[PDB]
Design a protein around this motif. Structure first.
Motif, PDB file in Angstrom:
ATOM      1  N   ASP B  67       0.986  -1.517   0.175  1.00 28.16           N
ATOM      2  CA  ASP B  67      -0.299   0.098   0.225  1.00 28.16           C
ATOM      3  C   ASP B  67       1.121   0.886  -0.359  1.00 28.16           C
ATOM      4  OD1 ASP B  67      -1.835   1.824   0.091  1.00 28.16           O
ATOM      5  OD2 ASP B  67      -2.415   1.724   3.001  1.00 28.16           O
ATOM      6  N   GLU B  68       0.005   2.313  -0.770  1.00 30.73           N
ATOM      7  CA  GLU B  68       0.898   3.554  -0.716  1.00 30.73           C
ATOM      8  C   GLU B  68       2.632   3.069  -1.500  1.00 30.73           C
ATOM      9  OE1 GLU B  68      -0.395   5.994   0.491  1.00 30.73           O
ATOM     10  OE2 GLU B  68      -0.307   6.547   2.500  1.00 30.73           O
ATOM     11  N   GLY B  69       2.426   2.329  -2.209  1.00 31.86           N
ATOM     12  CA  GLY B  69       3.716   1.645  -2.978  1.00 31.86           C
ATOM     13  C   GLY B  69       4.669   2.783  -3.517  1.00 31.86           C
ATOM     14  N   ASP B  97       1.147  13.365  -8.179  1.00 28.69           N
ATOM     15  CA  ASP B  97       1.024  13.916  -7.317  1.00 28.69           C
ATOM     16  C   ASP B  97       0.223  15.010  -7.049  1.00 28.69           C
ATOM     17  OD1 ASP B  97       2.279  16.048  -8.502  1.00 28.69           O
ATOM     18  OD2 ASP B  97       4.245  15.591  -7.914  1.00 28.69           O
ATOM     19  N   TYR B  98       0.405  15.726  -6.334  1.00 33.68           N
ATOM     20  CA  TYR B  98      -1.222  16.743  -5.960  1.00 33.68           C
ATOM     21  C   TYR B  98      -0.883  18.192  -7.637  1.00 33.68           C
ATOM     22  CZ  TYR B  98       2.023  20.543  -4.234  1.00 33.68           C
ATOM     23  OH  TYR B  98       3.600  21.615  -3.775  1.00 33.68           O
ATOM     24  N   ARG B  99       0.718  17.725  -7.558  1.00 39.84           N
ATOM     25  CA  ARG B  99       1.044  18.615  -9.175  1.00 39.84           C
ATOM     26  C   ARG B  99       0.730  17.164 -10.298  1.00 39.84           C
ATOM     27  NH1 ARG B  99       6.767  21.739 -10.210  1.00 39.84           N
ATOM     28  NH2 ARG B  99       6.091  20.952 -12.651  1.00 39.84           N
ATOM     29  N   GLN B 142       5.709  20.795   0.065  1.00 47.24           N
ATOM     30  CA  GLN B 142       6.559  20.075  -0.184  1.00 47.24           C
ATOM     31  C   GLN B 142       5.734  18.647  -1.299  1.00 47.24           C
ATOM     32  OE1 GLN B 142       6.134  18.726   4.308  1.00 47.24           O
ATOM     33  NE2 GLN B 142       6.942  20.553   4.082  1.00 47.24           N
ATOM     34  N   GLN B 143       6.637  17.810  -1.614  1.00 43.51           N
ATOM     35  CA  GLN B 143       5.262  17.047  -2.239  1.00 43.51           C
ATOM     36  C   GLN B 143       5.070  15.305  -1.397  1.00 43.51           C
ATOM     37  OE1 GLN B 143       6.946  13.795  -6.066  1.00 43.51           O
ATOM     38  NE2 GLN B 143       6.920  13.188  -4.190  1.00 43.51           N
ATOM     39  N   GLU B 144       5.374  15.076   0.042  1.00 46.45           N
ATOM     40  CA  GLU B 144       5.269  13.951   0.701  1.00 46.45           C
ATOM     41  C   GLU B 144       4.432  15.146   1.177  1.00 46.45           C
ATOM     42  OE1 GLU B 144       8.270  11.070   1.576  1.00 46.45           O
ATOM     43  OE2 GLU B 144       6.867  10.247   3.715  1.00 46.45           O
ATOM     44  N   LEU B 145       3.807  14.805   2.285  1.00 45.80           N
ATOM     45  CA  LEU B 145       2.775  15.740   3.031  1.00 45.80           C
ATOM     46  C   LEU B 145       1.661  14.733   3.158  1.00 45.80           C
ATOM     47  CD1 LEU B 145       2.366  18.082   5.372  1.00 45.80           C
ATOM     48  CD2 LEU B 145       0.796  19.138   3.055  1.00 45.80           C
ATOM     49  N   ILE B 146       1.612  13.762   4.037  1.00 45.79           N
ATOM     50  CA  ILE B 146       0.466  12.354   4.547  1.00 45.79           C
ATOM     51  C   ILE B 146      -0.971  13.258   5.507  1.00 45.79           C
ATOM     52  CG2 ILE B 146       2.603  10.846   4.582  1.00 45.79           C
ATOM     53  CD1 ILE B 146       1.017  11.804   7.887  1.00 45.79           C
ATOM     54  N   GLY B 147      -1.697  13.218   4.618  1.00 42.60           N
ATOM     55  CA  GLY B 147      -3.231  13.866   5.879  1.00 42.60           C
ATOM     56  C   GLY B 147      -4.455  13.022   4.707  1.00 42.60           C
ATOM     57  N   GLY B 148      -5.064  13.502   5.018  1.00 43.31           N
ATOM     58  CA  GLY B 148      -6.337  13.284   4.529  1.00 43.31           C
ATOM     59  C   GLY B 148      -7.015  14.178   4.121  1.00 43.31           C
ATOM     60  N   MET B 151      -6.357  17.920   4.004  1.00 44.75           N
ATOM     61  CA  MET B 151      -5.408  18.393   2.981  1.00 44.75           C
ATOM     62  C   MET B 151      -5.372  18.269   1.620  1.00 44.75           C
ATOM     63  SD  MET B 151      -1.784  17.432   5.608  1.00 44.75           S
ATOM     64  CE  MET B 151      -2.935  16.632   7.400  1.00 44.75           C
ATOM     65  N   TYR B 152      -6.647  17.657   0.884  1.00 46.63           N
ATOM     66  CA  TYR B 152      -6.414  17.045  -0.353  1.00 46.63           C
ATOM     67  C   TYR B 152      -8.179  16.468  -1.038  1.00 46.63           C
ATOM     68  CZ  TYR B 152      -1.607  15.868  -0.320  1.00 46.63           C
ATOM     69  OH  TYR B 152      -0.282  15.639   0.588  1.00 46.63           O
ATOM     70  N   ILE B 153      -8.436  17.060  -1.226  1.00 44.92           N
ATOM     71  CA  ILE B 153      -9.733  16.901  -2.432  1.00 44.92           C
ATOM     72  C   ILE B 153      -8.872  16.095  -4.118  1.00 44.92           C
ATOM     73  CG2 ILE B 153     -10.841  18.062  -1.208  1.00 44.92           C
ATOM     74  CD1 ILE B 153     -10.499  20.127  -3.954  1.00 44.92           C
TER      75      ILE B 153
HETATM   76  C1  LIG Z   1      -1.608  13.378  -4.230  1.00 42.19           C
HETATM   77  C2  LIG Z   1      -0.437  13.665  -2.326  1.00 42.19           C
HETATM   78  C3  LIG Z   1      -0.528  12.759  -1.639  1.00 42.19           C
HETATM   79  N1  LIG Z   1       0.481  12.666  -0.450  1.00 42.19           N
HETATM   80  C4  LIG Z   1       0.157  11.411   0.803  1.00 42.19           C
HETATM   81  C5  LIG Z   1      -1.189  12.077   1.611  1.00 42.19           C
HETATM   82  C6  LIG Z   1      -2.001  10.356   2.124  1.00 42.19           C
HETATM   83  O1  LIG Z   1      -1.666  10.645   3.540  1.00 42.19           O
HETATM   84  C7  LIG Z   1      -1.333   9.763   1.210  1.00 42.19           C
HETATM   85  C8  LIG Z   1      -2.930   8.527   0.711  1.00 42.19           C
HETATM   86  O2  LIG Z   1      -2.392   7.331   0.784  1.00 42.19           O
HETATM   87  O3  LIG Z   1      -0.899  10.331   0.675  1.00 42.19           O
HETATM   88  C9  LIG Z   1       1.133  13.187  -0.827  1.00 42.19           C
HETATM   89  O4  LIG Z   1       2.295  12.857   0.128  1.00 42.19           O
HETATM   90  N2  LIG Z   1       1.393  14.410  -0.930  1.00 42.19           N
HETATM   91  C10 LIG Z   1       0.888  14.305  -2.745  1.00 42.19           C
HETATM   92  O5  LIG Z   1       0.711  14.759  -3.544  1.00 42.19           O
END
Ligand SMILES: Cc1cn([C@H]2C[C@H](O)[C@@H](CO)O2)c(=O)[nH]c1=O
Ligand SMILES: Cc1cn([C@H]2C[C@H](O)[C@@H](CO)O2)c(=O)[nH]c1=O
Ligand SMILES: Cc1cn([C@H]2C[C@H](O)[C@@H](CO)O2)c(=O)[nH]c1=O
Ligand SMILES: Cc1cn([C@H]2C[C@H](O)[C@@H](CO)O2)c(=O)[nH]c1=O
Ligand SMILES: [Zn+2]
Ligand SMILES: [Zn+2]
Ligand SMILES: [Zn+2]
Ligand SMILES: [Zn+2]
Lengths: 160, 164, 160, 164
Positions: B67-69, B97-99, B142-148, B151-153
């Motif tokens: 998961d989260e490969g 990513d978000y970009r 920052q690309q890695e930003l873990i959350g739900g 922070m994301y849609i």
């Molecule tokens: C789209 C995206 C998700 N995520 C993370 C947020 C969530 O904790 C996880 C989704 O399982 O991925 C990032 O860290 N950067 C990103 O650009």
């Protein structure tokens, strides 16, 4: 912009998991889902007629075990034509691989049909598409789980 | 009698992890042993920042679920090694990513996969269109930003390029 | 209401047949398709830049061998955002299973990705997902057919 | 080392036959022998009104491709016999008629299939929506009326219920 989606396959293919995936999906986007189980809003009934016009008050309708409902086609089509997203999870075949309930009448009305597979419980190295009943009952409707049913590939379905 | 790699991709809230676990529950039911590797006799759930923190453990199972490969740098070789040992490797991960830039190692992994399934979500802005991209709502780079959902849609194409 | 669709897999999976299926489909509904081959309207070019704003004058854009075009992502995204249906057929990997051209950059921009399989030409009883090059050349771009390439499963890819 | 049944369904102009033939060309390329049965060393194309006009011929091939599967009354047993003999049986067929009533034997066949793929066309009326049904344009009642775009169009749900 309404439609009917059908999810079919044998038991233990994760059909209900898949239906609920599609629901959770809609819930996140603030779309209202109405889940109709056999017997977010979760009603439980033996015929879809028992649900009044309640369905009108939601965006999406999720029907689990769609096979057990005799009025499945007209209910779904009415909902679809009212602009609802109708989603049905159901067994396509019984333990004898005979068409189960109304599902096969529903296929021509569907804009999507997805058939899921399980893993074969006998050879354990082949995808399963059928259900074998393990107990000796004849009646097609016999609700239960792994105590009464197992999923198999074609070879294992015919083998003892 | 063979091994393989299966990839499950799409934006957030497409039910990728639900789907991965569907495939697992499926194997568990048939008495096949699954090893679930999350980021940070029959079922095992390890939690790791690099896959090779597992050494040879994976050898003792039939199926490997990752998961989260995207967050694993050695995803390709680990999977290929497992696949070539006759394992069923299953990866759930964000393709972008978000970009909408390639996320981690996933795009390297595609040529090694015998199945790739891209799931869709529903668009959180127009709420009447299938969503294939992830939009970040907070103002972080920052690309890695873990959350739900805080922070994301997930969005369709139209809503991705528009505001509010 | 525009989008990007990607069709991937090894050679002899029928990717181009599939792309054209999707085209013929649009043509019947009086939707105008523009087919861009590498080198209804069928242009042939070495870079998508050679096609001007011609694409604007059509509803659908079909790109075959999408891998060989260096500006695939921006071209497609521009077309998609202009409300076009963009359809790409392409190899995801080379004969070495290295990412081929720009395809892997395109995946995050796609609303649909379908990976097709072929049948394994060595064991002839297993689905094929990779391509093996039969000749001894190194250069990744080497256009040709069954004289130079064969499709295989995982076992047969590694076996001599 | 096994046989199976695969079903390809949808309305007209969804490319069902193109898809069936894709799957055939695929097998032909790998030196697997395909036997194509249309209605009315490696590749053979017979034309029949009932499948059992074939007797045992199908036994001499690896794959059986049945186009217009709907028009054959013995579709289920023929396919199952072939499947159980270790053949790959592939059927392309309309799931519904111009009235969306179950067409021929297809719906009986679904419970016996290990794969079912439903293809879509593009809607010939609104031209901006995927089509899943077939509308007959001429004013005839009889279900079996063979023909093309002169007598049928594919439509979405909205356009199916509307005129012109
Ligand atoms: C789209 C995206 C998700 N995520 C993370 C947020 C969530 O904790 C996880 C989704 O399982 O991925 C990032 O860290 N950067 C990103 O650009
Ligand atoms: C296979 C089969 C299942 N079932 C039941 C068992 C389960 O509770 C439900 C399927 O989820 O339907 C039948 O009633 N008849 C059948 O033939
Ligand atoms: C597998 C492979 C195919 N090709 C070519 C052969 C075909 O003409 C085309 C794929 O349809 O691309 C390459 O250039 N490089 C490769 O690595
Ligand atoms: C939808 C439909 C198609 N057909 C025929 C017309 C075409 O010749 C054939 C499509 O392969 O099916 C019918 O005969 N009746 C119908 O209701
Ligand atoms: Zn089995
Ligand atoms: Zn949107
Ligand atoms: Zn092989
Ligand atoms: Zn329409």
């Amino acid at each position: 912009r309404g439609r009917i989606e059908l999810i079919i396959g044998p038991m233990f293919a994760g059909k209900t998991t898949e239906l609920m995936r599609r629901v959770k999906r809609e819930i996140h986007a603030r779309r209202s889902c109405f889940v109709i189980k056999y017997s977010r809003a979760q009603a439980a009934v033996s015929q879809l007629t028992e649900v009044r016009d309640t369905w009108k008050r939601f965006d999406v309708l999720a029907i689990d075990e769609g096979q057990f409902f005799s009025d499945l086609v007209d209910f779904c089509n009415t909902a679809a034509d009212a602009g609802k997203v109708v989603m049905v999870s159901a067994l396509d075949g019984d333990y004898r691989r005979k068409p189960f309930g109304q599902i096969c009448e529903l296929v021509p009305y569907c804009e999507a049909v997805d058939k899921l597979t399980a893993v074969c419980m006998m050879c354990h190295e082949q995808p399963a598409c059928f259900t074998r009943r393990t107990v000796n009952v004849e009646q097609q409707e016999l609700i239960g789980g792994a105590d009464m049913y197992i999923a198999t590939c074609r070879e294992c379905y015919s083998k003892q």
